[PDB]
Design a protein around this ligand. Structure first.
Ligand SMILES: Nc1ncnc2c1ncn2[C@H]1C[C@H](O)[C@@H](COP(=O)(O)OP(=O)(O)OP(=O)(O)O)O1
Ligand SMILES: [Mg+2]
Length: 331
């Protein structure tokens, strides 16, 4: 027996069922592109179960006793085991709708709704978007300008270099302020699509006005290609950095998030992911414990109270869950 909720079981970075999970995740992604959110979650959950298994699935008999494995996900796995390929998955892969929605949604600042609108309007390629600049936000224009670099996996070596410049800028702007790497890299991932940093200071309020200072410093070093600062709920800067490399440079997406230290454990938990892990953790919190969890806090709607947490461990404990380090949150 394996627990139902992804937040009740360790999911490591590397596993034994990558072919099967990849296929189910194609179907999940395609469902999301069609606005079929239930079906997305269902396929995502099934793929997550395979990631938590200790052995490869070689025969269909191994599916027995697993949660979140309905008829459809089972058929997909069955066809892959018996025939090496799943016709439904291959049809999705080859479909113009899926290919175009994947193309568009990958671009910085483009979500499903925008990509679907563009599809419906007859846009198909990146050049089509460039021919219609009035249809694009500034953020999307920047994503198109740098699209090749932004669809090149970000590497741990890139992350280490970026963390150094961000730490230097933060330290120079405000001694005592800290930078914490979050997102998939904190979970042990070797690559990613962006780099996520959470900034705070141990004295509540000393973080005020820090981010614009940090950004000024980075911009003056030539390290910023694009920056969008927003006060709202955490203060954040959505950026594209110009990462110098030997004889070259590459654009890399970086999100900088400032949280007041009182909210830091909630922010770190939220921003560390995985996306499915946090969805599951919030569902667990609400359904099993009656508490509402988000990136700012843990609220009891009956008592109208907020839980004081010093750490992620505090939050897990309060929810009655065994602690999972970030590298076991790869749901
Ligand atoms: N839709 C969402 N639901 C819940 N949490 C989310 C969602 N989107 C983002 N988050 C949280 C969890 C993520 O780990 C974190 C950073 O997002 P993001 O950088 O897109 O993912 P990631 O860093 O884990 O993977 P990647 O390797 O693609 O960067 O923010
Ligand atoms: Mg990330």
């Amino acid at each position: 027996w394996m627990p139902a909720y992804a937040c009740q079981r360790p999911t490591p970075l590397t596993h034994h069922n990558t072919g099967l999970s990849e296929a189910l995740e194609i179907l999940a992604e395609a469902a999301g592109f069609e606005g079929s959110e239930g079906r997305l979650l269902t396929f995502c959950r099934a793929a997550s179960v395979l990631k938590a298994l200790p052995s490869p699935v070689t025969t269909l008999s191994q599916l027995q006793g697993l949660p979140h494995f309905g008829e459809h996900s089972s058929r997909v796995v069955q066809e892959l085991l018996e025939h090496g390929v799943c016709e439904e998955v291959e049809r999705v892969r080859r479909s113009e709708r899926y290919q175009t929605m994947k193309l568009f949604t990958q671009i910085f600042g483009v979500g499903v709704k925008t990509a679907d609108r563009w599809y419906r309007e007859g846009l198909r390629t990146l050049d089509d978007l460039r021919e219609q600049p009035q249809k694009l936000t500034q953020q999307q224009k920047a994503g198109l300008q740098h699209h090749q670099d932004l669809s090149t996996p970000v590497l741990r070596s890139d992350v280490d270099a970026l963390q150094q410049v961000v730490e230097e800028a933060v330290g120079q702007a405000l001694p005592g302020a800290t930078v914490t790497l979050t997102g998939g890299f904190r979970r042990g991932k070797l690559q990613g699509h962006d780099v996520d940093f959470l900034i705070t200071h141990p004295k509540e309020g000393q973080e005020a006005g820090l981010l614009p200072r940090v950004m000024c410093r980075l911009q003056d070093q030539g390290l910023i290609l694009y920056h969008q600062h927003q006060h709202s709920a955490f203060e954040r800067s959505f950026c594209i950095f110009r990462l110098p490399q030997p004889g070259s440079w590459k654009a890399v997406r970086v999100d900088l998030v400032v949280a007041p230290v009182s909210q830091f454990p909630f922010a770190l938990l939220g921003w560390t992911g995985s996306k499915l892990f946090q969805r599951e953790l919030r569902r667990f919190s609400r359904k099993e414990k009656g508490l509402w969890l988000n990136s700012h806090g843990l609220f009891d709607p009956e008592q109208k109270t907020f839980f004081q947490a010093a750490s992620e461990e505090d939050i897990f404990r309060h929810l009655g869950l065994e602690y999972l380090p970030p590298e076991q949150r790869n749901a």
